[PDB]
Amino acid sequence: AFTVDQMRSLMDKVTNVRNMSVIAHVDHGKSTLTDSLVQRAGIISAGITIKSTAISLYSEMSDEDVKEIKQKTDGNSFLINLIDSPGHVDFSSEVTAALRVTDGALVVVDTIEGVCVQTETVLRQALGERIKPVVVINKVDRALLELQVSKEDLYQTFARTVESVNVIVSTYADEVLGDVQVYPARGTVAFGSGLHGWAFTIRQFATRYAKKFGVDKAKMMDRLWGDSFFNPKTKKWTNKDTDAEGKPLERAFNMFILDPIFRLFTAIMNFKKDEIPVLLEKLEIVLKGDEKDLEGKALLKVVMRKFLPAADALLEMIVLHLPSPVTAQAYRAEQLYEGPADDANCIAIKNCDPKADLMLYVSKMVPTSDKGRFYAFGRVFAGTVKSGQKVRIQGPNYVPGKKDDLFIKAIQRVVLMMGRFVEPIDDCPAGNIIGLVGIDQFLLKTGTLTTSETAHNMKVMKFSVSPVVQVAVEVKNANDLPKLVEGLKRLSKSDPCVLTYMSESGEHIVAGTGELHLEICLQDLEHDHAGVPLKISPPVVAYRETVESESSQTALSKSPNKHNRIYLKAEPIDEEVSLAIENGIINPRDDFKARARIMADDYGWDVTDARKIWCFGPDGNGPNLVIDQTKAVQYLHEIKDSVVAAFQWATKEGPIFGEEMRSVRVNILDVTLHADAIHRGGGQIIPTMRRATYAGFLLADPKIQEPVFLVEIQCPEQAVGGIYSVLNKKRGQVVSEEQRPGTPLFTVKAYLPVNESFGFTGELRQATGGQAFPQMVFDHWSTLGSDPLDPTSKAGEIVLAARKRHGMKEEVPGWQEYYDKL
Ligand SMILES: CO[C@@H]1[C@@H](C)O[C@@H](OC[C@@]23C[C@@H]4[C@H](C)CC[C@H]4[C@@]4(C=O)C[C@@H]2C=C(C(C)C)[C@@]34C(=O)O)[C@@H](O)[C@@]12OC(=O)[C@H](CCCCCCCC(=O)O)O2
Ligand SMILES: Nc1nc2c(ncn2[C@@H]2O[C@H](COP(=O)(O)OP(=O)(O)O)[C@@H](O)[C@H]2O)c(=O)[nH]1
């Protein structure tokens, strides 16, 4: 327990500060180990509550051991900050940002299950941020009490684990740090049981056995591990697992360390009453009061704790081997700064200089009971933040040349994040971890607070600023529609990042930056902007009705007089052309000379068609045509207006299910009209044309076309695999994967069926730890090979569902009901 003054004092000596976190796979013991640490070293102040993000630990070392510290030191006291980052192990972004404020890690590894997958994934992440590790093989009790392991066996398991780790380390750690591998002999690997409350390091033993009988420790600890043996008989040290007579010799580690431990377990767990007292007498393990009447487990726990207090071993490695802000910021400053390595600020970070311009990294915002408020949490890398001081909050985006929506505000208060409690402080010098009240609105998630103008931003998580999620929105009571329409306009004004629009299928669509963004946009819309009961739903997809080939036989249809008859056929127009029609290159409003040249010379159509085309449909200019290939027909030109209108009709709503036609060309092969106008007017022709087209259409191997998005995702070469996994489950098709010379992030491009997209952006982030950054756009129509008229096929399923939704007959009228024989 300390006072704000006491605390502030600890903060001045940043050489004696340790910023770290416990890295561990699930269930390996991280929670219990940290509590172990908190119970002995945890710090308190001597009602606002917050979500614990970090804890302060206090540890004082001996004048001697303090000399074992190969790094600038000042005093015997140390302030250790145990940062906490346990959510979604996969989400590398979320994690990395958090690990970024630490300089060291206590890597935990189970004795039995050793180094595994989740383990090396976090260890590799750490190395990524240039963090130095130390290991603790935990749950050693498990190996004994359960597996009945033998001394040489256990040693082997440890050696194995230690070796595995180092592979990960050397194979990935930067050379700019020097061999950062872990060595049991050098005291950077601990062994113990977090649960039972005991652990040890080679150093602890070597040091003890180093004064009991004056002998140097450095030398001694090198022997207490590896292939060094001590022949009891010869009274000498050997490097041979066999003596002169070739006879077996016991390893130093097993002889002087493991053995004492193994004996204590046997003598206790076997209730050997007589040996216990003496065994304890030789190890100098003194028990008090009632403790002398414990048995088995209950006694073993008490003894081991008194013998090898787990805290001491862990605290030792942290103080003697994990770097101080000073030591680390020197070789970590590069990566932490987006700007030039010679910049003023980048150099301050290098120097953990408190007198410089502020370089404060906001790691994340944290929820408090201070009424919806969030205190900013992070590290002061350069300069010193002060309560009141004005600061330049620099968002994820910001750049020194653009007002870029910066934010120059005043730190309402600087505070210590003591677990669930905060304590007001005046200022805080570089190298410390700290919390800030008053930046709730100006920033969300990562950020940077500088006091300089040339000051660039520090390496923070990047954002998603493209519309990647959307839903259709409808009012529940028809009469509120105008309120929804007005609300949608309001929503947009108040939010530069929201997008609203009308779907081809007449729906109000609202798209957001990510799921959460969308969620609030909807809440805001329903209860504020429009204030009306809404109905959110997956938007309805539009399809196109087309033909795969020409009518298998002339389509014939007689008017309701039986007087007039149309013989036509249909065939598929080419995509290139439909596209030209659609993009306005082949336009109905252009002079004929222009249109004629284009279709004949650039799109290779017969030079005589352009003059026979009667119209484009639907709406006069759609990618569908009526070419008059008749001949001796007398009054052929008297019905033109009717045929055109009938065409504008059939193309707006095809026969498969009322969707627009696309790429359809109808050839009016022949017509046998009447002689008098009385029996050929509108009412008689339209019905014949319309009907005959449907007949032609249906007879031309009809098909449906589905809309398809073009999606572009930028993501880390590692997570790039998730992109593929999701896309495979959604009929997606990869178009290209292009590398970036410096591996800052590959960019994958692929086609994703629109009807295969609801929830995609969400699934993408899940399969990539939010590492992938998508953006998508409508790109093209694509014919489905399946048969639209067979309810079982993908297409038939679609049509079925559609007709159903529409309240149409579920069955699709075959061509015959449109065809007219004899
Ligand atoms: C500039 O905004 C664009 C916006 C105006 O139009 C969008 O495409 C809309 C389209 C546009 C085309 C053409 C007009 C012809 C056929 C229609 C469609 C019919 O089904 C096919 C498309 C999807 C529709 C609906 C299902 C919503 C469409 C429609 O009916 O309008 C995209 O082109 C747009 O670009 C963006 O960047 C954000 C992307 C939103 C992506 C949502 C992805 C969903 C993933 C998830 O929810 O997980 O939106
Ligand atoms: N036998 C044994 N069990 C342990 C030890 N440390 C933790 N456990 C148990 O392992 C499980 C997971 O531990 P916990 O610390 O919550 O794991 P974490 O998910 O890594 O934080 C719990 O049931 C613990 O009680 C240990 O040293 N020995």
Swiss-Prot record:
Species of origin: Saccharomyces cerevisiae (strain ATCC 204508 / S288c)
What does changing V167F do?
Causes resistance to fusidic acid and reduces sensitivity to sordarin
Q: Which residues carry this modification: N6-methyllysine?
A: K489, K593
Q: Which reaction does it catalyse?
A: GTP + H2O = GDP + phosphate + H(+)
What gene is it encoded by? EFT1
Spell out the SUPFAM superfamilies in the cross-references. Answer: EF-G C-terminal domain-like, P-loop containing nucleoside triphosphate hydrolases, Ribosomal protein S5 domain 2-like, Translation proteins
Return the protein name.
Elongation factor 2
Q: What's the effect of swapping P539 to L/R? A: Causes resistance to fusidic acid and sordarin
How is this protein's activity controlled?
Inhibited by fusidic acid and sordarin, which prevent the release of eEF2 from the ribosome after the translocation step. While fusidic acid acts on all eukaryotic eEF2, sordarin specifically binds and inhibits only selected fungal eEF2.
Q: What are the tr-type G domain coordinates in residue numbering?
A: 15-326
Where's it found, cell-wise?
Cytoplasm
| Modified positions (Phosphothreonine) in chain numbering | T693, T743
What does the UniProt function comment say about this protein? Catalyzes the GTP-dependent ribosomal translocation step during translation elongation. During this step, the ribosome changes from the pre-translocational (PRE) to the post-translocational (POST) state as the newly formed A-site-bound peptidyl-tRNA and P-site-bound deacylated tRNA move to the P and E sites, respectively. Catalyzes the coordinated movement of the two tRNA molecules, the mRNA and conformational changes in the ribosome.
Tell me where the cross-link Glycyl lysine isopeptide (Lys-Gly) (interchain with G-Cter in ubiquitin) is found: K821
